[PDB]
């Protein structure tokens, strides 16, 4: 088995830019065997390059495939809007983990909000606590839950929006799920957010039962 | 034109089996290897195996041995993927896919003569969702807003414990669209989905402007309008 | 000169009075074997061969298809939704050697390099009027009654790095396989010497380790029509299907009796010639016995073993062109200018 490595996994780029995607094989291959695909929104991928450098059907000449030995590249000479996608290299049965093209913009700190469980939800024996990180860039963010100052683990889940079409930011929810009994047992609920746009981590919190 | 067309979304309980079909057209079915590729939502492409429609010989990736069966009906130009002993790890999109042809109109053609791995023609993909849940409409809870970040307040509704996808969420019957984020649903360990929908609004409009999230879930024929206000 | 495609003629030692079907076919399809066979060494000549793209293989396939269509008539053919009925008498069916020979204006080149793998340049070449005599044995998994390698086992594959490519193994030492339907009438068995078979796998592992320096595992077929999940062959005019799990179930790391294969005679078979089923008459009574030499193997290598300390090989087959390739790999046709 010849493994395939694609890194970076995310390239932050701009319209009109020259973009270079990298693919590395675990041992030397013939260029006849290296393939590039692109995939948009989890739909069927489509062919970009075969045999390292031969453009597939419908692929314009701003796409250039090159490489040999173990090191291969897909170059887009001048990026267009339609080019934003996830690109996968394939060598025999092996796929790289993909490189996503993302729209580069300036750092934007998240606005952070915390929401306690509703009284109506508590009736049903479960409590959801939600932490909202709104309109931030870049994507990387750490959200840590604390209950009575104790670090929580394995009882929260994060969901993230796709990059916004107008401002190119992300938004993210972190939802902490507790039993009603566990919720009523403790007082202070807090989510602490760490992000490049925040000089120091930001904590939002509430005390159970207080206005 | 070559076309690979797969069967529709399936929901299956854990432990059950599922069969996906891949109906081909526009070429000689028996002459080209069929491959299957798995993609867990948000993750990369994983090759599962190939099957030679001439004779039905197979080659399964070690990770899927015991899980997959790849078969065909040559008369119907159809390939099948069957997954057994379903678990949550099997929730994914499955693609049938074939590489380029190579026979060049020669007399005897076998898919094993080709390269195979220049994957060119894909099925549209088939989603398999593993959950013990039956159809269930959502509960809708308020995310109630002082709390000002970025000069603005935030509110929303938590749309919890429904099955299957999708739900649609609107605010004030579609009049409120600016600043709205409806997050992707997550399939919880319970086998039910949940999501939140939020919106940021002027902090000086609370109690003077009414905010209603409208939640519709077609599979259970339920509609919920939940007014979201600050708790005094 | 240059590689060319033409119609080779065939030669055989068939006899007019034999009702055995290969004899009958060859009596009209072939000439008598060449009384004066001559090999001419070509001094200092190098030549490219490709056993995987060889029109000799394509013609042999066409020819053995016509042999079978003329010789082994099913009672019923199920090609598509259709049904085609005809007379279904039992026959004597036992392969004889067929030679393929160059027509005037053409020549057959022969690779005389005993270590040639089947694709690439050959530094030791001769011209021949005819191939050696090749028995057109139809079987899966195990290659029977064929040619042997001279010094060490050969592993032949267009590119063994590609798990979709068929692997043809050629043995040095033949291994007897003896199959019997004793006097349920469909039940039969094959016997293989365990010591010989184990020594055979050892030799095969030694060569495979040159491509994959790992633990080597042999495992049984994991899917497909019965013809390819079993060792299928014919004997006494009947079609045998033998479970080869007892042949392919071992692990060979770098370190630190009789094998019985159950078989069944089938009346319903999947044709190798073309897509379709054929039905033959119920089995003849009496004792049926075939003693053959295993001289090669058809294998597939498990793909996707993303990070393992082992490679797994399973018996394969089904495309009988691989059977013809195992014999014709050292030949190519050229047009002499
Ligand atoms: C087989 O494929 C491997 C992997 O790409 C390559 O390095 C090697 O050169 C190929 N062998 C032949 C004979 O083409
Ligand atoms: C070519 O092969 C033949 C038969 O194996 C052998 O007799 C001859 O010596 C070989 N030629 C060379 C130059 O080794
Ligand atoms: C089997 O091999 C031995 C030794 O090479 C040979 O004497 C015998 O004729 C072979 N039998 C068949 C049926 O090919
Ligand atoms: C198979 O039959 C041969 C004769 O063709 C005999 O020499 C050999 O001992 C037999 N092998 C068995 C029964 O394993
Ligand atoms: C198996 O083969 C070995 C080596 O050819 C031979 O010495 C031995 O007698 C055979 N065993 C049987 C049971 O025939
Ligand atoms: C198979 O043969 C090899 C030959 O070296 C030997 O090391 C091994 O022990 C044998 N295995 C069995 C089960 O007889
Ligand atoms: C193959 O691996 C074994 C065990 O790791 C080692 O002893 C041997 O030298 C290796 N051979 C080659 C050619 O790398
Ligand atoms: C392969 O071996 C397994 C394990 O004994 C068995 O269940 C399976 O039926 C065998 N396959 C064939 C084709 O005989
Ligand atoms: C083949 O033999 C193995 C081992 O005895 C057995 O487990 C399997 O069921 C057999 N396969 C068939 C199809 O009978
Ligand atoms: C495969 O061989 C092992 C010993 O190596 C044995 O325990 C097992 O029963 C065998 N499996 C079959 C299906 O015969
Ligand atoms: C192999 O050759 C022997 C000797 O001619 C013959 O008896 C046997 O039937 C052959 N086997 C097959 C499968 O053709």
**Rounded CA gap, C333 and B122, in Å?**
39
Separation of CA C62 from chain center: 15
B121 in the same domain as B206? no
- What size, in residues, is chain C? 337
What contacts C138, CB < 8 A, 6 or more positions away? C64, C68, C233, C234, C272, C320, C323
Work out the widest C-alpha separation in chain C, in whole angstroms: 62
Q: Output the CA torsion B15→B21→B22→B26 (10° steps).
A: 170
DSSP B29: G
Separation of CA C215 from chain center: 27
Q: At what resolution in Å was this solved?
A: 1.8
**Rounded CA gap, A83 and A70, in Å?**
25
Question: Sign of dihedral through CA atoms C120, C126, C128, C131?
Answer: negative
Q: Position of tokens 């002993």?
A: B85
CB A27 within 8 A of CB A5: no
B10 in the same domain as B109? yes
Q: Is the CB of C124 within 6 Å of ligand 2? A: yes
Q: Would you tell me the crossing angle of helices C21-29 and C55-71 to the nearest 10 degrees?
A: 120
Please give the structure tokens belonging to residue C24. Answer: 């009958």
Question: Sign of dihedral through CA atoms C127, C130, C134, C140?
Answer: positive
Q: Is the CB of C112 within 6 Å of ligand 2? A: yes
CB atoms under 10 Å from CB of A72, counted, come to 26
Contacts of B49 in chain C (CB under 8 A): 303-304
Q: Mark which of B132, B147, B168 sits at the end of a domain.
A: B132
B144 in the same domain as B105? no
Give partners of B (≥3 CB pairs < 8 A): A, C
CB B228 within 8 A of CB B206: no
**Rounded CA gap, C118 and C48, in Å?**
10
Please give the structure tokens belonging to residue C91. Answer: 């026959």
B12 in the same domain as B108? yes
Number of domains in chain C: 1
Question: Sign of dihedral through CA atoms C53, C56, C62, C67?
Answer: negative
What contacts B105, CB < 8 A, 6 or more positions away? none
- What size, in residues, is chain A? 211
Q: Mark which of B73, B104, B132 sits at the end of a domain.
A: B132
* Nearest ligand to the CA atom of C123: 2
In three state form, how does the secondary structure of C194-244 look? HHHHHHHHHHHHHHHCCCCCCEEEECCCCCCCHHHHCEEEEECCEEEEECC
**Rounded CA gap, B189 and C329, in Å?**
58
CA geometry: angle C280, C282, C284, nearest 5 deg: 115
Q: Categorise residue B151: left if φ over 0, alpha if ψ from -120 to 50, beta otherwise.
A: left
Q: After which residues is chain C broken (C to N over 2.5 A)?
A: 183, 256
CATH number at residue B191: 2.60.40.10
Number of domains in chain B: 2
Q: Output the CA torsion A77→A82→A86→A87 (10° steps).
A: -40
**Rounded CA gap, C320 and C140, in Å?**
8
Question: Sign of dihedral through CA atoms B203, B207, B209, B211?
Answer: positive
Please name every residue paired with C122 in a beta bridge, in sequence order, or none if there are none. Answer: C47
- C198: domain range? 1-337
Please give the structure tokens belonging to residue B105. Answer: 């109109």
**Rounded CA gap, B207 and B229, in Å?**
7
Contacts of B115 in chain C (CB under 8 A): 162, 164
CB atoms under 10 Å from CB of A120, counted, come to 12
Phi, psi of C25 (to 5 degrees): -65, -50
CB B107 within 8 A of CB B118: no
CB B156 within 8 A of CB B176: no
B146 in the same domain as B78? no
Cα–Cα distances (Å) from B82 to A5, B78, B160, in that order, read 30, 13, 32
CA nearest to B48, candidates B109, B6, B101, B90: B90
Query: B226 exposed, middle or buried (CB, 10 Å; 0-12, 13-18, 19+)?
Result: buried
Cα–Cα distances (Å) from B136 to B88, B126, B164, B222, in that order, read 19, 23, 7, 9
Assign B81 to helix, strand or coil.
strand
Assign B200 to helix, strand or coil.
strand
**Testing the interface with C: which of B28, B38, B48, B59 to mutate, by most C Cβ within 10 A?**
B59
Q: How far is A2 from chain C (nearest CA, A)?
A: 8
**Rounded CA gap, B68 and B62, in Å?**
10
How many CA atoms lie less than 13 Å away from A11 in the CB half-sphere?
A: 25
DSSP C114-150: TT--SEEEESSEEEESBPPPB-----SSEEES----S
DSSP H/E element including B3: strand B3-6
Parallel, antiparallel or unpaired: strands A111-115 and A63-68: unpaired
Q: How far is A62 from chain B (nearest CA, A)?
A: 20
Cα–Cα distances (Å) from C7 to A82, C64, C328, in that order, read 53, 14, 15
Please name every residue paired with B184 in a beta bridge, in sequence order, or none if there are none. Answer: none
In three state form, how does the secondary structure of chain A look? CCCEECCCCEEEECCCCCEEEEEEECCCCCHHHEEEEEECCCCCCEEEEECCCEECCCCCCCEEEEEECCEEEEEECCCCHHHCCEEEEEECCEECCCEEEEECCCCECCEEEEECCCHHHHCCCEEEEEEEEEEEECCCCEEEEEECCEECCCCEEEEECCCCCCCCCEEEEEEEEEEHHHHHHCCEEEEEEECCCCCCCEEEEEECCCC
CB atoms under 10 Å from CB of C31, counted, come to 14
**Rounded CA gap, B225 and B218, in Å?**
15
Q: Is the CB of C145 within 6 Å of ligand 3? A: yes
Taking the Cβ of residue C309 and every Cβ of chain A, the question of whether any pair is shorter than 8 Å is answered with no
CB contact under 8 A, A113 and B181: no
Cα–Cα distances (Å) from C6 to B110, B199, C33, C234, C333, in that order, read 22, 77, 20, 31, 8
DSSP H/E element including C21: helix C21-29
Query: C170 exposed, middle or buried (CB, 10 Å; 0-12, 13-18, 19+)?
Result: buried
Contacts of C307 in chain A (CB under 8 A): 1, 3
DSSP H/E element including C27: helix C21-29
B157 in the same domain as B121? no
- B45: domain range? 2-132
Q: Does domain A106-208 have CATH number 1.10.1740.10?
A: no
DSSP C59-109: HHHHHHHHHHHHH---SEEESTT--EE------------BEEEPPTTEEEE
Please give the structure tokens belonging to residue C99. Answer: 């030679």
Query: C143 exposed, middle or buried (CB, 10 Å; 0-12, 13-18, 19+)?
Result: buried
* Nearest ligand to the CA atom of C46: 2
**Rounded CA gap, B40 and B130, in Å?**
12
Parallel, antiparallel or unpaired: strands C310-315 and C215-218: parallel
CB B154 within 8 A of CB B228: no
Contacts of A92 in chain C (CB under 8 A): 161-163, 303
CB contact under 8 A, C319 and B112: yes
B154 in the same domain as B118? no
Work out the widest C-alpha separation in chain A, in whole angstroms: 68
Please give the structure tokens belonging to residue A124. Answer: 């049903």
- What size, in residues, is chain B? 232
Q: Where are the domains of chain A?
A: 1-105, 106-208
Assign B205 to helix, strand or coil.
helix
Assign B35 to helix, strand or coil.
strand
B79 in the same domain as B124? yes
Q: Mark which of B84, B117, B132 sits at the end of a domain.
A: B132
**Rounded CA gap, C286 and C274, in Å?**
32
CA nearest to C247, candidates C221, C283, C280: C221
Q: Does domain A1-105 have CATH number 2.60.40.10?
A: yes
CB contact under 8 A, C319 and B70: no
Please give the structure tokens belonging to residue B178. Answer: 């600016």
CATH number at residue C302: 2.170.40.20
**Rounded CA gap, A207 and C51, in Å?**
78
Taking the Cβ of residue C161 and every Cβ of chain A, the question of whether any pair is shorter than 8 Å is answered with yes
DSSP H/E element including B80: strand B78-83
Q: Long-range contacts: B145-151, Cβ < 8 Å, 24+?
A: B145/A113, B145/B203, B145/B206, B145/B228, B145/B230, B146/B203, B147/A113, B147/A114, B147/A204, B148/B203, B149/A111, B149/A112, B149/A113, B149/A134, B149/A204, B150/A111, B150/A134, B150/A135, B150/B200, B151/B203
Assign B215 to helix, strand or coil.
strand
B156 in the same domain as B126? no
């Amino acid at each position: 088995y010849i493994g395939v490595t694609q890194s970076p996994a995310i390239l932050s780029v701009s319209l009109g830019e020259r973009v270079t995607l990298s693919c590395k094989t675990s041992q030397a291959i013939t260029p006849r065997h290296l393939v590039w695909h692109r995939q948009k929104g989890g739909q069927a991928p489509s062919l970009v390059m075969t045999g390292t450098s031969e453009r597939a059907s419908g692929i314009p000449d701003r796409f250039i495939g090159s490489g040999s030995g173990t090191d291969f590249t897909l170059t887009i000479t001048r990026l267009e809007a339609e080019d934003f996608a996830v690109y996968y290299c394939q060598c025999l049965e092996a796929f790289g983990q993909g490189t996503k093209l993302e729209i580069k913009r300036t750092v934007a700190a998240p606005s952070v909000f915390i929401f306690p469980p509703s009284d109506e939800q508590l009736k049903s024996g479960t409590a959801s606590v939600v932490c909202l990180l709104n309109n931030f860039y870049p994507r990387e963010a750490k959200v840590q839950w604390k209950v009575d100052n104790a670090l929580q683990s394995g009882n929260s889940q994060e969901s993230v929006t796709e990059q916004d079409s107008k401002d190119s930011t992300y938004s993210l929810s972190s939802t902490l799920t507790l039993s009603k009994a566990d919720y009523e047992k403790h007082k202070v609920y807090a989510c602490e957010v760490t992000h490049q746009g925040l000089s120091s981590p930001v904590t939002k919190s509430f005390n159970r039962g207080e206005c | 034109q070559v076309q690979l067309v797969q069967s529709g979304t399936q929901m299956k309980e854990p432990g059950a089996s599922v069969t996906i079909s891949c109906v081909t057209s526009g070429y000689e079915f028996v002459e080209i290897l069929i491959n299957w590729v798995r993609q867990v939502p948000g993750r990369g492409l994983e090759w599962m195996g190939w099957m030679n429609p001439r004779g039905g010989g197979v080659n399964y990736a070690r990770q899927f041995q015991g899980k997959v069966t790849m078969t065909r009906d040559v008369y119907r130009d159809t390939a099948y993927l069957t997954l057994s002993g379903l678990t949550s790890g099997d929730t994914a999109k499955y693609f049938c896919v074939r590489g380029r042809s190579c026979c060049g109109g020669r007399r005897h053609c076998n898919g094993a003569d080709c390269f195979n791995w220049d994957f060119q023609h894909w099925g549209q993909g088939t989603l398999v969702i593993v959950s013990p849940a039956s159809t269930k409409g959502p509960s809708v809870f308020p995310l109630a807003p002082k709390s000002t970040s970025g000069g603005t307040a935030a509110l929303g509704c938590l749309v919890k414990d429904y099955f299957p996808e999708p739900v649609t969420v609107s605010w004030n019957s579609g009049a409120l669209t600016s600043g709205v984020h409806t997050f992707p649903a997550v399939l919880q360990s319970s086998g039910l989905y949940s999501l939140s929908s939020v919106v940021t609004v002027p902090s000086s409009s609370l109690g003077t402007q009414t905010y209603i999230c409208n939640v519709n879930h077609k599979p259970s024929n339920t509609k919920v309008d939940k007014k979201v206000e600050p708790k005094s | 000169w240059k590689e060319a495609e033409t119609t080779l003629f065939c030669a055989s030692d068939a006899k007019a009075y034999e009702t055995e079907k290969h004899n009958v076919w060859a009596t009209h399809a072939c000439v008598p074997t060449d009384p004066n066979p001559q090999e001419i060494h070509l001094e200092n000549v190098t030549e490219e061969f490709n056993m995987w793209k060889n029109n000799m293989v394509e013609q042999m396939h066409t020819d053995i298809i016509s042999l079978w269509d003329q010789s082994l008539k099913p009672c019923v053919k199920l090609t598509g939704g259709s049904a085609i009925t005809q007379a279904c008498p039992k026959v004597t069916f036992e392969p004889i050697p067929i030679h393929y020979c160059a027509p005037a204006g053409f020549a057959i080149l022969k690779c005389k390099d005993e270590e040639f793998n089947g694709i690439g340049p050959c530094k030791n070449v001769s011209t021949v009027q005819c191939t050696h005599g090749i028995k057109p044995v139809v079987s899966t998994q195990l290659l029977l009654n064929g040619s042997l390698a001279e010094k060490e086992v050969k592993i032949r594959c267009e590119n063994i790095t590609n798990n979709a490519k068929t692997i043809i193994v050629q043995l040095v030492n033949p291994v007897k396989i003896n199959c019997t339907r004793p006097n349920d009438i469909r039940q039969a068995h094959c016997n293989v010497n365990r010591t010989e078979w184990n020594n055979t796998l050892h030799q095969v592992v030694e060569q495979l380790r040159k491509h994959f320096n790992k633990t080597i595992n042999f495992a049984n077929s994991t899917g497909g029509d019965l013809e390819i999940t079993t060792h299928s062959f014919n004997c006494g005019g009947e079609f045998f299907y033998c479970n080869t799990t007892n042949l392919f179930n071992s692990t060979w790391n770098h370190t630190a009796d009789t094998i019985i294969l159950p078989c069944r005679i089938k009346q319903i078979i999947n044709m190798w010639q073309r897509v379709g089923q054929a039905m033959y008459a119920p089995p003849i009574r009496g004792v049926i016995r075939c003693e053959s030499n295993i001289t090669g193997l058809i294998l597939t290598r498990d793909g996707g073993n993303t990070n393992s300390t082992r490679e797994t090989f399973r018996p394969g087959g089904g495309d009988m062109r691989d059977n013809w390739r195992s014999e014709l790999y050292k030949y190519k046709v050229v047009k002499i200018e």
